[model samples]
Target: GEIQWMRPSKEVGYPIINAPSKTKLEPSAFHYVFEGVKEPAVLTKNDPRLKTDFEEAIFSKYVGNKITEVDEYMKEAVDHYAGQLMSLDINTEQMCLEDAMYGTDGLEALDLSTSAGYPYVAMGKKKRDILNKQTRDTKEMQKLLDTYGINLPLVTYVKDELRSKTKVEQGKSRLIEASSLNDSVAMRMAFGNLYAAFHKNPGVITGSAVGCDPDLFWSKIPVLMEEKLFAFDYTGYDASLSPAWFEALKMVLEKIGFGDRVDYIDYLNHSHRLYKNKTYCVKGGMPSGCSGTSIFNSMINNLIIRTLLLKTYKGIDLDHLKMIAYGDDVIASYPHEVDASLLAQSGKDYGLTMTPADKSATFETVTWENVTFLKRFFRADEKYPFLIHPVMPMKEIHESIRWTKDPRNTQDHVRSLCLLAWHNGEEEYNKFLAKIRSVPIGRALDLPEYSTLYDRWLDSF
Candidate 1:
């Protein structure tokens, strides 16, 4: 059996050859597309439609400001919405109210109905008192002041002493009182306070991203992306097996001339090895065969097809195939008709099988669904589309000059900005301003001058 990769360059154009099979006597002859093209074939330069769609989706469901393009205003809006939604309080108390609104006996009814259930109350009254005391301790005030070099006025110092002492004592007294009461009260109070503090001062919990401390936010993108990718379930993709396969595939692809040109393999490999497999193992056992396993297997199989295409299709460019592979989901692009046909034919020639599910044939017949397209495809679908962020927003063909740029925002910046963006419709901007205002001066003082301490202070002012 032999493998061949082929695709149509146009509706009636000659089928482009991408890759060929290898035998012991003769190594495969792979065509290099980048060498001929010299520059990346721009998939879609600053696609304005993408940005418009994203803004339209966001504004239609929320507020309608004249967001002409997805500039800073739009980015901030997104960040703000995410922050607000993430900060939403979704505890039992809230649920009970929802239940009441629907005319139910509240969570009590649900709890009673369950055989092994208790009232979904919290625990720990005594520990809360200890925490409260620790928070109060006036002596710690002076230590805090000293640590931060805060030049406290006499009146302010007096006030701090009084407040700290009162809070500490109150917390301690609550703990003592809770010993006689139900544990839930103390636990709930403590939990509530903690939650309040975290939201009230998120910058303290996660640190600031804008102004001088930009790196604090920027550095978190890769980590966040890794986490999101890993969270996707990949059944049967175990720790040892998945990683070994990924490494083997990566090495083989690089040898076959796709080392740096394509990144889908790298991203998927990293996600599988560093996140999916590890997380699955931690959660008791490995995932059984499912969508996750299918996706992984599909990617590996696709890589093989891509390699063969690069070697066989003389008219087709290897780099183009590599770029296509960057997005494993074929439904996102219009080239799927060609890609599917090539893969199907290659599979048959090489005694490989590429089975299609019912939905696959119904939906993915003419599109690309690579990773890049997943978010966008969902947003574009009439039934279950999603809003997606793209590299560009619009095009202005004025003659004076030319400008091109990709989306750029550090993680911290996005985190801070998202909150405002998310709540642009709500009266939450004032609260955001107030929270930023309340950041401890001491914490700011400790950071190095280069960290943008002075800049942040100016912005706050």
Candidate 2:
């Protein structure tokens, strides 16, 4: 599928109804057409059409045997860990659903009656819908469990402030409000955290990934799954497991006792996605819009990183390398310089395409000796070993302020910019604040919450 650009018109192309005109002339169109359909589809805010087009193209690329272009580069990198699973020695005992869910602070159950996955809802409406939906889903999930002759006590919904102390000089981290996460989402988060914790090491931060972070970009390769493994069939003949990118996932699940319950899990996994107001299914991978895909993708990414790092430094203890991951973005600091080629090759062996530093969209920059994890650059220091400092690309900084062109988003822009300052220190914050004020109607410091955040920022300094 090739993306085509055309001037926006009322008939020929879908116009960005709320597109800000305060900046430029009629924006050159952002649209695309699938080769088969040849129908133009416009890209607009909150519109998932363009992303959908890209996903389809990726599926087509991998399914049509264009893999030769990617596969040819990997023959020379020796597979030190011949058996991928045996290399990691991941604990199979504590991997069960019950333990995983029990280990979490609490579980969250989402209501899907109004929309399949996470839908766009106003704060008030979203709150009301979540409460009503949680009640409905609790009973629904209980019935399903009973139907399957499985018995587990379903936890009640309680919103509480959960906090954890950090490695900081003194103060603990911020409070994390609880959610009404259902059993399915509970399982997803639980398993994700379990794997991440298993690979805990210093200098690990689980930054944003695919569904959550817009900066992270990579090609999606098709994963072939055995029929019994996934417990469900697809709508098309070219069935492939998208998450199979994490090859060890199923083995880990089986080791942890999800083998018999795989179908039950799939039932919940497949049930959530609603398209045009009804549940829909796709041929491969987890459904694109599924709520669990973020955690699922994160789990896959962390596992891949864990495998690569372990393979690179043979017999390295798990405690030596911490695994913090979100979707595809992982930041794991090694004691010594990790082999760049081995990381790239091991990544390829696991069906991942490692983005080169030049074309990387993610915030984390991986190299032979050093890395920029999140917004901080971690460099060598004699006393600290890995000294960290705030760093970001000029392009990221420019784009961070780009959303304020529409005055409607001014308040959020102010709040976000203020938070950025709070984290990065007053120097960057003061300069950015001035930049924000220059935007059309961007001075939104009057909001009470904004003022509160600003006050906190001052206190930080």
Candidate 3:
């Protein structure tokens, strides 16, 4: 049968008398805030890590007025700015509510990484009612937690105010734009320390395999884990089905006695206003790019991590495989290019399969997939896989300049290219602005921000 789970739950109330659910990780009143989410709240909103993260951002606009006549307000704005402030490749394609969401089935998709994190609470043992039995009634479970002297030390909203503060102005300038968005400086340091401790370490795993170089950084640990665990494969990773897997995990973790350390949420709240659509939470995954998403992935993966560290897990020596995963990206290696059933059988008892989306089983030939780690995509060649990065696009340059000049000297677009050029260097900057001189509606490289070769690559409307 098709693996179906996630029995409906909006089901709640004052769960468990004197329950320890009074939300930890509250920020100081002097700190930043998410309204309707205070320390006393049952749920709190998670903050974004990146500016690109949609916390207080707009995603898509829908027809708020009547669907018949026209979106006159937008049409008017475009008519006014059409080629004056900006150009538009405008179209009048329209869709009714039914047509646009043709096969949506009223279900939103979940992120594979975050959903997996949500399930780590279960460890994948139950068929149904996973979060139910344990969550509202975990009196017995707390005893085991106390025996180990486990303190949840639960924290959800910690900011790293000091990373930018503590460093020199130049050093701070070098830090990534997202480095200062934390709730506290100490949490940022803790994150920094945690990443530093694991990213370069040989055996430790904190989950993200991105950043740096994929080929080089994931070099040792994956192979080590592969050898210890035997070969692995991708059964396909489905973002929507994770809730079922989550319950399965919940059941497994409960009997294993290590569930306490894993059971918790950093709280996730979304403004449904963001989506004129009314959906309350997800069964498969939570919203993307929130702090809860990170914690979800890390803690769930930690289940396997903690188990792997044990000297005796079911009397099996689990040094494990070259198979390692961070987010949707995963890698696996075997001794010789061979065997499907062997991999399936050997890895069955406790393993995850990042199945290709179609989820249909398949055979494989290649030793690897195109590896993308940090800031680059690599196509595997025996010698050099990294394509070009310190590279810019000619077409992009042609458009960027005209777009900037069309409004006749817009700052944001102009400054951005300059900033990128300056950071990359003069030669790169020149290359960025190459190939155009006296174009019509385009700047060709206006506003001397950078790009020494700003004239070569520009064109007119």
Candidate 4:
């Protein structure tokens, strides 16, 4: 896994590792754009975070043991939520269709971190087609999902966006390229300030957590290990199903008169295959590289997050608490004090370990922080206030370019310049760009001019 600046190929939507011709990057040359290998940093034995078989085994066991608790939770959840399952004021059916059609399912991307290993483009296409077909008949799809009830797994479009926006710029170009194809600045600051002004008296406590997804209750985790240990030719790994969730799903389907079609959920979940002299019967937990894992995880998380709020506040108005979540990472804002320990403890019932590491509470000035939530920098001041301002976040940009060149950062810088000029009539972006361009590293890269780079990126779209 040597590092290199590799571009995407039409065949795979990313660089083919074996094909050297696909990558031709000159660090010192002035290029309008650039991209990376779109994979994780190559780990050395010296790396502290480098994973070991023993650690993975322990984690698998820990996760496996902890998953058992979800059974009890599910039993309680199902009993308390008999017909009340779909009462989240959410249209699960619509969410499914929209996710399939417009969301992650539509553009299944390669996920290299799965047990399935490399050469995943084929499964990616097959999954995309299956997801797309499900949305063809919204009514029929709705009925099928209604059968699966709250256990339905959504699509992969979003994770793809995240990977593309960060990993490979081509990921972003895909959507831009997909449509042949296809937000705001200032008044946004004013609007944010206005809200902060109106809600001045109420102190806001924002709570968040670490590791929401990987620890979620899935299936018999050790089975994956068993496949590796017993099945001599086992070269691939995938999620093993949790019978509790599976059984709960079936019960709901049976209740909705779709018991005969119970296999529908199972089919979407796992696949049995005999390949390369091995019989691969992967049982459940939305396969990792497959599109449904993140989407489905989000679906369950939404249920858990909203449900947690209701149970935590009890008699408090649901309006007082507000939450926004993407995948496992969750952030909730409430205008009063609520113990983080209470939230953390409640999170465990659903197999979520809420940590204080990423959690914080802020008041007086409203603030929300996340690195990859679309753009960078989200802060608003209320009194004698500076409205919400978007900064370039040079530290991340600098780190991204440390090993290789990033035309995307240049693109972001240029885009920020436009936004600031249009909204605040500011030239801070220009000053920032000049500062970066003047830096020793920037000079060494011989980066392209801002306008030329912007055109290069835009024309690629």
Candidate 5:
């Protein structure tokens, strides 16, 4: 028979088990309940110095003022550009609805293109509708385009070309031209023309040219390109390099900008050689207890980042896995049972043993909520059943003391005062000494004899 424990009599707001209702205990509750278990033998925190050394190592590897400033600048540039793009009010929702209602055949019959350019054309028509409602003038329309840095000529061409063609034809043409140099040239020309138009009439463009400010538009274009390049470089490097070499190359790239179009594989090999030969870890010191948690968090974050990168660059859906850590404890998640088992087995092979609870888990049945609940068991604090915060001073502070000097027969006078203070009593004398230590040199002292002596010493100097 299995061990029996109580269960909840009724559903409550919280998930706690009732102690009085059950005849059989669940394995999870039996293992995790902290009230009746004896202390288990596990790793102990014996060295406080390790935490200090770990923090110092991490801080030292930081690229410091210059790199931090550059990162901040780049962040601002990205935000500015995203804001500008988001502000543009292109009404694609109505067009999509209209297309959906008509069906593919009906849309074809109507002779409209469902290509990428179709959206731009629809947007321009919507703008024209609004313009027609207002005091009609080419100057106002031109001004609107100029303000947004959009070329009126390009807008005209897209609108005219798209309106004249059937949706099916337009869609086919767009697909054909999508990856061609002609498309790139067209886009560049459109942007350039828009910029020129913006200088002609800033006011109308501000409101009409897809809600963009000219300055922000220009500023963000380069930043957007750089971000894409960074993503590409990281992905290419990760795919080409082994885990160890990838780690080394990441540090190098963070410190110095890797030139465009460098041989990534050669760079990885060179980086690995330097890493293996170097006397110090890039950050220095042996990996600490907290390092496990750090590594796990990084792996989980990188998994998401890699997924996004694949979607952005290759237009592909990539599988992702997450591994979270709280100190030496770890929790991993995957969509498939096989994947979970393989991941757990690989970690075990590398000397990271999972607890019995984790070992019994199946990935296919595990949802994100389940993983989060498991993580709570290993998270730091009093409530957690298995994990504990190591007993160590996480920070330190120190203070030093000094003695005040006298001027008149400076050394002799100070010696006499010390002797007198010492004779009074240890507590009193120490307190007096502390006051003397606190006083700044070349300044008057509360003790008359010391003050006079200090004055004499100053005069002599």
Candidate 6:
């Protein structure tokens, strides 16, 4: 909720919300369709009134087959690793199957309860739908596990011990933080970090294209899952085994086409959630996380957008434009922003809203939720002195450096910028630290507790 990786396209389109990008205006219209229907696909997409051309949405090379489109690409990348796994000489598929079925080392348990941070307090039928999903979640899962192995135990939930004797996880990171994230997100990390690092130095900063709060621009196109695929779970699929997952697995091994099919690659995926009280569960989106969501989205985003960017600059490669996408956040470097116009248009032509770069929104140009998005882009010629300052709100900055005073609260995440100054010598980072130091200490440099945690996390750096 504090705006971490989600980057929601918006809500009430839940259908009342507005998003970062404005919905392009067209003649006002009406439709009698979208009447009450049961299937999420029907209720959601069959408006026939929304003025969308979905005939291809489900089949477009560019979007999800409604189910998904990245199996080809996902396998290509993973098989290379699987081969190395095969070189290790083992029951590759079996190993892949079980591990994917369970968590890493089987040590992690799914964190489902409301405690994990899904806020749904709706009542009545909406609540009932959840109840029913969790009810059959395990048996539904157990059936799928049966396809791959003989006697697997009932698919179980991780006990509270693993949910954390404490509570849910928190949000935080840097652009490098983008390195480990999911599609539609976690991608901003590297792009933001690299851009911030390089932005202060030169003349080229103005030409890059960046999606401002991007994930909202496109969507995870939904596919109607058939009964066979239901084994993968339309609802309540968590970190568990499912045979349909095995089908994805088989496709992967066969496609890995590595000649020696030690034939390992279990889909090990998810569909939706189950409450800790086991009182409810929810249906999942097509190609849901269990279906290996972000990787597929990222793969297709990269493949689709990368192909378009290549056609941009006199036949160049993705690297040529510094082309990188983190989920919805897309960016490419070129001599001019319009240099990417054709690519942006191709993106919009996509039912997915891959449009032009920052002007109205400006690409998260400040640091928020602790990660830097846009920062000081001001600078003179390369020969001039410059300080690459983080773009942060005044309140957040003071509260952050307050411990520095200054730092750390609520087990706050590491303040890289502050420590950055501490190591570089205050003069170099003085502009910001001075503000921290300037705040009235009411006669104390810092309270002792501040020094402890600040030094602790700081020393680790």
| Estimated TM-score for each candidate | 0.21, 0.48, 0.33, 0.43, 0.20, 0.33
Those runs of model 4 whose alpha carbons end farther than 4 Å from true positions after fitting are 1-40, 43-62, 65-288, 307-321, 334-336, 357-377, 381-393, 403-428, 439-461
Worst 10 residues of 3 by lDDT: 172-181
| Candidate 5 structure quality by residue, lDDT tens digits, 181-221 | 12222222222222222223222111112222322232222
Query: In candidate 4, what residue range of length 10 has the lowest lDDT sum?
Result: 175-184
User: How do the residues 111-150 of candidate 1 rate in per-residue lDDT, one tens digit apiece?
Assistant: 1111110111122112223222213333432333344331
- Which candidate wins on TM-score? 2
CA RMSD (A), model 5: 32.6
Alpha carbon deviation, residue 245, candidate 2 (Å):
5.0
List candidate 2 segments past 4 Å from native. Answer: 1-114, 117-130, 133-247, 254-260, 264-288, 309-319, 357-370, 375-394, 404-409, 422-425, 447-461
Whole-model lDDT values for every prediction:
0.24, 0.34, 0.28, 0.32, 0.25, 0.26
Clashes of each: 47, 11, 42, 8, 21, 19
Clash total of candidate 3: 42
All candidates: CA RMSD (Å): 29.4, 15.1, 23.8, 16.0, 32.6, 18.4
Model 4 clashing-pair count: 8
Off-target runs (Cα >4 Å) in candidate 5 are: 1-34, 40-286, 289-316, 319-338, 345-357, 361-364, 377-461
Could you tell me the TM-score of candidate 1? 0.21
**Per-residue lDDT tens digits of candidate 3, residues 268-350?**
21111011111122223323333223333433333333232231233332223234445333443334343434334322323
Candidate 4 or 3, higher lDDT: 4
Off by over 4 Å in 1: 1-302, 308-314, 322-339, 348-358, 362-372, 375-461
Best-performing candidate as measured by lDDT: 2
lDDT of residue 14 for candidate 6 = 17
Model 4 residue 290 CA deviation (Å) reads: 3.1
